[PDB]
Design a protein around this ligand. Sequence first.
Ligand SMILES: CSc1nn(-c2ccccc2)c2cc(NC(=O)C3CCNCC3)ccc12
Ligand SMILES: CSc1nn(-c2ccccc2)c2cc(NC(=O)C3CCNCC3)ccc12
Lengths: 301, 296
Amino acid sequence: GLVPRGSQILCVGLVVLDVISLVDKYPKEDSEIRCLSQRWQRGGNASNSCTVLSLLGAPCAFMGSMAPGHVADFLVADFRRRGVDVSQVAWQSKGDTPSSCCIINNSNGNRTIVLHDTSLPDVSATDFEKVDLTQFKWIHIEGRNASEQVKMLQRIDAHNTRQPPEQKIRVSVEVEKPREELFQLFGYGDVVFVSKDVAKHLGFQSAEEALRGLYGRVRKGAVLVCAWAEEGADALGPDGKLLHSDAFPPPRVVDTLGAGDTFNASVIFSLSQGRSVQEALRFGCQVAGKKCGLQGFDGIV
Amino acid sequence: GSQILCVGLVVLDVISLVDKYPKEDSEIRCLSQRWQRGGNASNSCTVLSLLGAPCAFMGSMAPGHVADFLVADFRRRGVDVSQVAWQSKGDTPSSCCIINNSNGNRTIVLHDTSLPDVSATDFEKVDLTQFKWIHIEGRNASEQVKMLQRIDAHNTRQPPEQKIRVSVEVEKPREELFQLFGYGDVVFVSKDVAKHLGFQSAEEALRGLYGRVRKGAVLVCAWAEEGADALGPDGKLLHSDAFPPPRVVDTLGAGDTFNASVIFSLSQGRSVQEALRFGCQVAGKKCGLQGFDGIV
Ligand SMILES: CSc1nn(-c2ccccc2)c2cc(NC(=O)C3CCNCC3)ccc12
Ligand SMILES: CSc1nn(-c2ccccc2)c2cc(NC(=O)C3CCNCC3)ccc12
């Protein structure tokens, strides 16, 4: 179908099928057991954020890798069930579409996770070259294969140079994995998200420390953002003013899977609507907080 | 009577292959992944099929995408599926299988839906005239004992050369199952059952349990890497050493492979001794491979 120019928010990242089983007690290797319940669930950061963008009322698209098969089929159908445009998927002739097994111990809350295989090629810079950008008002990139992703950002930068300011594509990036190669991604984007887990691995004990201690790594004029779960979230821009919003805890915490992606998507959304950074931190915290008290993404409205 | 019928479960196996089992609450990356049509009766058809024996599966499926996969795989193997007891109240079973590549160990997390078990009422609708052998995965006793009843009846009215051979698998240590022991010319009991029931070895289990079989029936007990044993009406104990591959990589469906190969052998007129041995040969060969393709 036809996508009006400059209307869509794109997220580039991982889609994965999570098979989530609820057990009484962790299984002894080599046993056989009945779970209490078992859910198949579309997962992955970029993928979760797409869902949140649609439910919020943004037109949005996912770009990641998949391979023909029954897993992709279920994933594509779950994407479409959430109104996500999947026409930018990078279909692959080699490799398994990512699938993960997660086992949630019902008598202690602990998650044991068999994570997907590494067989499937990441979206590459040459793949991104073939994409007509005029669709997108905002492009958000989940840091994975950094050396390639840098080329994509450089290509968006090149596109932008020629556009009137009112047709520039905003860019955001997320570094959520404590992996040296990713750290070069700070240098890109108007908005850079850093996870609590990355901050800590770099030795920072709080949002504020993380921001003050990493802002030097981001490009001129960029905003750097760090959610710290129940401690809410900070952002730091060019003006050096450390911004903050408290959390919005829900009556009781049901499900936190994807709360971080929900917050990313919500900030992006608010910013893309022309709200202030401070207004967007708040909204982010409000939406992610609400979601944490619901199963899945259903009632975040 | 050209075909073999198996009566049990078909289950979607979502398989992860890992090089060590994850410590509780840890997170490990798997070597690779695949989907497999599994379930006992389902695995046996795979095996009979591979061995060259026309066969048919009879179990409860629920229409959907899962079933479309299962059915397609069934057919890709040449398994007659026309006897499937379709439903509308429940999903088709599935499970996660973590397969330790270092010792082929397999760990199974089963999601059992509502999908009710095939019933005598479904079975009484079966043209027994196509079947040389009928094998029954022991599940709902009460309701299957009737299925057996039907077969015993049908046999009375037939030449001692046109009778239908019957095998029963008693997989679970459940008391309801203790009565299937019971019927059939060949009774398979697993190591787990035997153990979960007071016995320390195949030889013991066969002595312990023989008193419960139909006159002239063979009691069979596999015992993993120790091989397998059998006991007939003549009271001579039969053993077969295992055939371990040099590298065990995937034992998912070993037992079922053993059962199918014994059944195949017996249905070709081989002696019980030859059948025990062929059973271990194929099960062993399969434990050296991921999946089933390549046993023959
Ligand atoms: C800044 S927006 C945000 N709010 N909350 C939140 C606030 C109050 C009560 C409950 C949740 C979050 C929780 C997580 N994530 C988790 O808490 C996970 C729990 C398991 N360990 C990983 C973190 C991620 C983001 C948020
Ligand atoms: C009698 S035919 C047979 N051979 N093998 C075999 C022999 C040597 C190496 C590997 C396998 C089997 C293994 C199982 N079953 C298992 O190994 C199970 C694995 C999980 N723990 C329970 C036993 C069941 C039957 C057989």
